[PDB]
Amino acid sequence: QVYMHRDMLPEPRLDDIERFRQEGFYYTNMLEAPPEIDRVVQYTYEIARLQANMGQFRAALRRIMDDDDWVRFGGVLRTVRVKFFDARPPDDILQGLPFS
Amino acid sequence: MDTIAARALTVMRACATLQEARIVLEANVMEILGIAINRYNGLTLRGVTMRPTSLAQRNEMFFMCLDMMLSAAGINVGPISPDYTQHMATIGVLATPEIPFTTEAANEIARVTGETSTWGPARQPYGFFLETEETFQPGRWFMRAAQAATAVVCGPDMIQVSLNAGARGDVQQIFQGRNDPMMIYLVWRRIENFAMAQGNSQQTQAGVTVSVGGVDMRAGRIIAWDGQAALHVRNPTQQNAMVQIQVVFYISMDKTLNQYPALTAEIFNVYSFRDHTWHGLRTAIRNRTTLPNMLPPIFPPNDRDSILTLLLLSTLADVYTVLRPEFAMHGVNPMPGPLTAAIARAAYV
Amino acid sequence: MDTIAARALTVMRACATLQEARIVLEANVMEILGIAINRYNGLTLRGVTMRPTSLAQRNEMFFMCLDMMLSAAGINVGPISPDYTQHMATIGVLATPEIPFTTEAANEIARVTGETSTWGPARQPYGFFLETEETFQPGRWFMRAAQAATAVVCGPDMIQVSLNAGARGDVQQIFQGRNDPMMIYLVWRRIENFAMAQGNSQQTQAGVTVSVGGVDMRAGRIIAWDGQAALHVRNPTQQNAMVQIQVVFYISMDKTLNQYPALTAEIFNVYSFRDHTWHGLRTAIRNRTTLPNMLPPIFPPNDRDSILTLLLLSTLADVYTVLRPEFAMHGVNPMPGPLTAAIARAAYV
Amino acid sequence: MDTIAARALTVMRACATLQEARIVLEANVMEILGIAINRYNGLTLRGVTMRPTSLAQRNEMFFMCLDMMLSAAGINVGPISPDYTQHMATIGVLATPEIPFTTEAANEIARVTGETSTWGPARQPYGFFLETEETFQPGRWFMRAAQAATAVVCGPDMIQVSLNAGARGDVQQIFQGRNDPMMIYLVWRRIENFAMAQGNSQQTQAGVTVSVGGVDMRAGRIIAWDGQAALHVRNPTQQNAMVQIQVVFYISMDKTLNQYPALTAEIFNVYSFRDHTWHGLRTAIRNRTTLPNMLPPIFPPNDRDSILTLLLLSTLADVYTVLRPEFAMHGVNPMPGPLTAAIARAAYV
Structure with a gap:
């Protein structure tokens, strides 16, 4: 369950600071629940591989991102790590991608 | 190209x-x-x-x-x-x-x-005498004024000759002038029990003879007639006679559906519905051509462009099948759900 | 899949x-x-x-x-x-x-x-009026009680209308109710010589007019009839008249043997004998299907599974040919003799 | 090989x-x-x-x-x-x-x-009763002396049985002896209006039956007849009756054009003109064969060699096209002028 979907960083309006006793507005890329299966472009090792070798992967990926659609990278497992931040984490994390 | x-x-x-x-x-x-x-x-x-x-x-x-x-x-x-x-x-x-x-x-x-x-050379599709305005009752006698032998059409691939006792004559001219055959395949039979001008049953006695360009031909066998040879019928019998000559099939230099391997299947595939998207698309394409936009041409085409187009479209059709593309076209409004022959029928104008 | x-x-x-x-x-x-x-x-x-x-x-x-x-x-x-x-x-x-x-x-x-x-849309195989119980003699007059124009069948693909002098009427309803055609192709002719109720010969004078949906159509020419338009005949002549209308061919959305390229040849290859081993095998296989275990279906299948099965089998047949496999089968007893058309004929129950 | x-x-x-x-x-x-x-x-x-x-x-x-x-x-x-x-x-x-x-x-x-x-098994090309010498008028009464039920031919795929009131009898023998069918597909109808010995119109009443091998069959429905079972007609009606039995198609173990995929189209290609060089070439080649040197065989071949040859030639034909070989041939004299359907016609002897 690893997806990509262009998303904004939740910049809220601060009208009642004392009201930020709210959930301190944490963000997190871990999904509450997966997206609607119909709105997801499924990708395979092989599919990604080919598109990339041909030098079309980025393009396609971008298009999907622009269309506000989702893309899942199935087949492979990936070790998953959990980190917490106090502020604006490293770009290599925010805009980090699931491949080299 | x-x-x-x-x-x-x-x-x-x-x-x-x-x-x-x-x-x-x-x-x-x-x-x-x-x-x-x-x-x-x-x-x-x-x-x-x-x-x-x-x-x-x-x-x-x-x-x-x-x-x-x-x-x-x-x-x-x-x-x-x-x-x-x-x-x-x-x-x-x-x-x-x-x-x-x-x-x-x-x-x-x-x-x-x-x-x-x-x-x-190609085995033509329909009966020889299909483009005929007048036809006569099969088996019914008919002798035109001043003739001893009167040949006439009784169907799309049928002619019958009325002979008086002892009469004879050339028949070929009934066939000629129509189409442009290269070889007409015949088979003649004796009308053993035919109707007379009044309605009474009449028998045709054995012995009547039909010969092509001179040679005498048997009844009930196929004949390779070149369309130019003398089609001669003789009645040595002492009674009225009536014989039927049948064009089982003929060949000409006109293009048929067998010009290119299973062309038919392709054309079927092209004209087939699939869905509104495909349909309207295929239609809109053919509207730039001489081909009927949504109904299998009565007459098989004969030019490169036509055949070609059909082939391409037929393949593009299969492509459409595997790719399952989804898009719009001007004037096409698609219903979701199931298909049913019903909705398909309604699609063709 | x-x-x-x-x-x-x-x-x-x-x-x-x-x-x-x-x-x-x-x-x-x-x-x-x-x-x-x-x-x-x-x-x-x-x-x-x-x-x-x-x-x-x-x-x-x-x-x-x-x-x-x-x-x-x-x-x-x-x-x-x-x-x-x-x-x-x-x-x-x-x-x-x-x-x-x-x-x-x-x-x-x-x-x-x-x-x-x-x-x-596909060119149907058999004559239009093939599934008819009652047929009338071709060229013979027939007028139903109280009618001035009476149409009737005379063949698998044939009809003939009896017109009284000066009479007219719509005929289409004779076609309707049967099958579900999309386009019926016609060609009408004048029955120049026909039998009267008594048996005496009668002539159909030149002047009769067959119109479709209002437009006047020629005799001996093919006609694109939708089956819904007005099939009107008129006899402005001062004599009885009889006309034969021919359904040369029609097209419906029913599957024919041209749904898939050279399907026919394939079917033949499947249904072919080869030897007892093959035969019994091919049979035993189709037993699990809706297909006739050893005799070509009268009607062309219409479901994927059928078509598919055939194609695979036809190919598996060729495989058999090249491999020359030899093995037993329950209920199959091989006859070593050289094999003749006779021994084969017998094998088909 | x-x-x-x-x-x-x-x-x-x-x-x-x-x-x-x-x-x-x-x-x-x-x-x-x-x-x-x-x-x-x-x-x-x-x-x-x-x-x-x-x-x-x-x-x-x-x-x-x-x-x-x-x-x-x-x-x-x-x-x-x-x-x-x-x-x-x-x-x-x-x-x-x-x-x-x-x-x-x-x-x-x-x-x-x-x-x-x-x-x-293969759907044969021509009507069942094609190789017949004698034929009787369709719809006309005919009763052979001493017989109560008289079956007689009337077309290439048509027979009509004349029954006397209360008369019955087996009809199978009119079919047997010809060809070697495996299955004949029939469809019988009642000739509702026919001609009598003298010419008067006679009606066939509702009630006449036709049973195969004992079982009673409907009119207007197709029937799988093995040719060996009893084809029995009965006329329990108090009047003369006439029924028409039609051989819509039959299957025999004879080779047809559907023995090998789109064989037809190939043959067309082989027999096609192109130009004198090709023409005479293909001609000269076939002279060494059992095949007609320039006109489609009436009967579909049945030996490996023949079919093979055709295919090879059909291919070599296309090769000829693409390569545009320019060379002489003994007895052939090329007419460089553009080439028309006319000149083509002329080349075929």
Whole structure:
């Protein structure tokens, strides 16, 4: 369950600071629940591989991102790590991608 | 030029291979799509993929085939969709010797261009005397004024001759003037029990003879008649006689549906419905051609362009099947749910 | 799912390449076989070789193609031989993406599924009025009580209307109610000489007019009739008149033998004898299907499964030919004699 | 031996792909031609190039295909041209195992050899009662002396039985003796209005029955008759009755044009004109065969050799097209003027 979907960083309006006793507005890329299966472009090792070798992967990926659609990278497992931040984490994390 | 068509064919047939998701590509397919998609995306500037999986990628690829299909047929459909827009440079993508084509592709095109440019003998489809205004009751006697032997038509592939006792004569002229046959295959039988001018039953006695260009022919056997030889009938019998001559089939230099291998099946495939999208598309395409936009031409075509187009479209149809593209066209409003022959019937005007 | 079939097909078509033992294979082929046979033997545990020679090896391979063919068709034949036992896992083998499939095989399936799932206009096989109980003598007058114009059938594709002098009327309703045509092609003629109620000859004077939906149509010319328009006949002549209208051919959305290219020839190849071993096999297989176990269906199937099954079988037939397999079958007793058209005729129950 | 044919086929089909000078081909092809052309040149000693451009190069290549096509067919044409000469060595070339053949080629031959060696059920082309000498008027009463039920022919696929009030009888024998059908498909109707001995109109009443092998059958429905079962008609009506039984189609173990996929189209291609050179060539070639040198055989062949030859020629035909061979032939005199349907007609003897 690893997806990509262009998303904004939740910049809220601060009208009642004392009201930020709210959930301190944490963000997190871990999904509450997966997206609607119909709105997801499924990708395979092989599919990604080919598109990339041909030098079309980025393009396609971008298009999907622009269309506000989702893309899942199935087949492979990936070790998953959990980190917490106090502020604006490293770009290599925010805009980090699931491949080299 | 044929080369172009062959390429375009190959490419579509290649995309057809992209059935499901998890699959391994055939060597050739790659060399082809690889090179092709490149030149295409090169002059088209469209984002076609080698292995689509989205829908937009699938559409993109479809549009590519569509562009090539049209280009091969030299068809400029014009403004038919808000989603698709025919790219003209596609023609250039195909004229490049750089895109390879299959053996099959070339042999198929060589076949088309081959026969489509010359003629040949072909078993015609319908009865010889189909384009006749007048017909007579079969078995009923009829002797035209001043004649001892009166031959006339009694069906689409049937003629009957009325002979007076001891009468004889040439019949050929009834056949001549119609079509332009090369060989007419006959078979004559004695009408053993026919109706007379009054309605009374009459027998035709054995011994009556039919001879072609001189030679006497048996009854009930097939005859290779050249249409020019003397079609002579004699009645040595001392009674009235009536004989039927049947055109089992004939051959001419007019194109039939057997001009190109299973052309029929293709045409069926092209004219087949599938869905509103496909339908209206296929229709809108043929409206640039001499072919009936949605109904199997009564008469089999005879020009390269026609045959070609059908073939291309037929393949593009299969491509459409595997790619499951989804887009709009001007004037096409699609209903979701199931299909049913019912809704399909209603589609054809 | 089609993919599985495409693969299954490819494999057999590939095994079909093994004619002699000396020959060098097309690199491409060897590739396919090796992979297939591996993954097959891997889940089946049989000893198939890429290059068979013994017989038992050949049988083994044939059994493989058989297994696949059946798996691809979704057929469980059951205990039909002591030598062959159908291995179910064969389905999973075909599901393995690592196994390739030719472009030809791909397009073939895509065509099958393509048309099978939708409909399309097709030239129907038999005469329009074939399923009629009552027919009338051709050329003989007939006027029903209280009517001035009376139409009636006289053949499988024939009708004739009896008109009183000065009479007129709509005829279409004679066609309607039967089948579900989309376009009926006509050609009407004047019955110049016809029998009267008593038996005396009568003439139809020139002047009669057959119009469709209001427009006047010529005699002896083909007519595109939708089956819904007004089929009106008029007799402005001062004598009785009889006209014969002919349904040369019609088109409906019913599947014909041209739904898929040379389907016919295939069917023949399937239904062909070869030998008792083949025969009984081919039979025992179709027993699991809606298809006639040994005699060509009168009516062309219309479901994927049928068509598919046939194609696979037809191919599996050719495989049989090249491999020359030899094995037993429950209820089958082979006659070693050289085999003649006679011994074959007998085999068909 | 089939292998030899498959090879020759492959090679030609490959040469057919050489539509232009600088075009890029399919991988396999290149390696094949390379192998073939080499081994060919080896025993031939003619200078065939993998990429002909001149004409002489093109002729040489065509000659090669011709040499092969002939060798594969087992034909020896002899001195038919001052430009071409047949190298009997060509067969040794095709016998070389190092030369591969496509999966297609292999299957194409396996099909021919397969069916050509055995028999099978097939929808026959012409009406059942076509080979009859005598025919009776349709709808006219006829009762042979001393008989109560008189079955008689009236068309190529039509019979009509005249029954007396309360009369019954078996009719099967009118069919038997002719051909060797396996299954005859009938459909009987009641002749509602017919002509009597004198000419008066007689009605057939509702109630007449027709039972096969005992079971009663409906009118207007198709019937699978084995030809051996009892075809019994009964007239429990108190009047003279007349029924028409129709052989819509039948199946026998005779070879039809559907024995091998789109055989028809191929034949058309072989028999097509193109030009005098081709014409006379194909002609001269067939003179060594059991086939008509320039006009489609009335009857579909049934021996491997024949079918094979046709295919090889049909292919060699396409090859001729693509290569545009320009050379002389004994007895042929080329008319350079543009060529029309007219000039073509003239060439056919």
